[PDB]
Amino acid sequence: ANPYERGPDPTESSIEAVRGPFAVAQTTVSRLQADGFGGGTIYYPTDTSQGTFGAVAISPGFTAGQESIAWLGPRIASQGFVVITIDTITRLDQPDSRGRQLQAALDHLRTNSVVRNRIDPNRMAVMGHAMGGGGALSAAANNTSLEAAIPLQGWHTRKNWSSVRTPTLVVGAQLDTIAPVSSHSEAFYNSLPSDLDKAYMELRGASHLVSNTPDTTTAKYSIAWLKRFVDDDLRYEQFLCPAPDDFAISEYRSTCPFL
Ligand SMILES: [Mg+2]
């Protein structure tokens, strides 16, 4: 019996839902209260009766604020996660810095009075959009204990991610002209270790800014990935292996079976 399983058995509809089975509450971390990042919003399940939850930190991209990623916070948290959407120290911070700030945001959750008793501090993940996705890769590349990483239209000057030991879902936008997949997302997938649990999901017809408003394909497979690897929840492998056949996906490849 997997002690980290939360919520009822999933369906495609349940992972597409704008809100999952867990009611969510939120608390704000001010910039003055945030050591090593720019503040943020923490979304968490109020129901404690099934146990503690894994934690996820999400970074926006260059010049962007929390607003651009906020919709991910409650949508993911309501599936059974404590999720912090961050602001960065400055709007101009580059990817390695954003990765360090993602780690700082996770470290913050460990002692946050509102959520300390709701998180399993051993089970943590990182996500981000654009330079924030490069940040998520960098955070994993500097911390092999992270359980999942999800760069969304990630941008980074570093193309070699052989240091990453964290299961990673690389989400590309087919028509991205800012972080084009051929030189960013797909290059990242290809240099992640060949034996890592990993996947590349390309969003058909999508531009760079697909992640800045609700996108059901992004949410449903981000949720499945976090469930599968932050919770070791084998009930979600069905959505990842074999490749999704959604029309909204133009390309997909993975190191399935994860088991
Ligand atoms: Mg289908």
Author numbering: 2 to 260
Copy the relevant paper text:
The recently discovered metagenomic-derived polyester hydrolase PHL7 is able to efficiently degrade amorphous polyethylene terephthalate (PET) in post-consumer plastic waste. It rapidly hydrolyzes amorphous PET at 70 °C yielding terephthalic acid (TPA) and ethylene glycol (EG), outperforming all previously reported PET-hydrolytic enzymes, including engineered variants. All polyester hydrolases share an α/β-hydrolase structure with a canonical catalytic triad comprised of serine, histidine and aspartate.
We cocrystallized the inactive variant PHL7 S131A along with the PET hydrolysis product TPA. Addition of Ca2+ or Mg2+ improves the thermostability of PHL7 by up to 7 °C4. Three of the five water molecules in turn interact with the sidechains of E13, D246, and D247 while the other two are only coordinated by the divalent metal ion. This Mg2+-binding site of PHL7 resembles a Zn2+-binding site identified in the thermophilic homolog Cut190 (binding site 4), which was described as a site unrelated to PET-hydrolytic activity. In summary, two metal binding sites have been identified at the surface of PHL7. Similar to previous studies on other polyester hydrolases, these may as well serve as future mutagenesis targets to increase the thermal stability of PHL7.
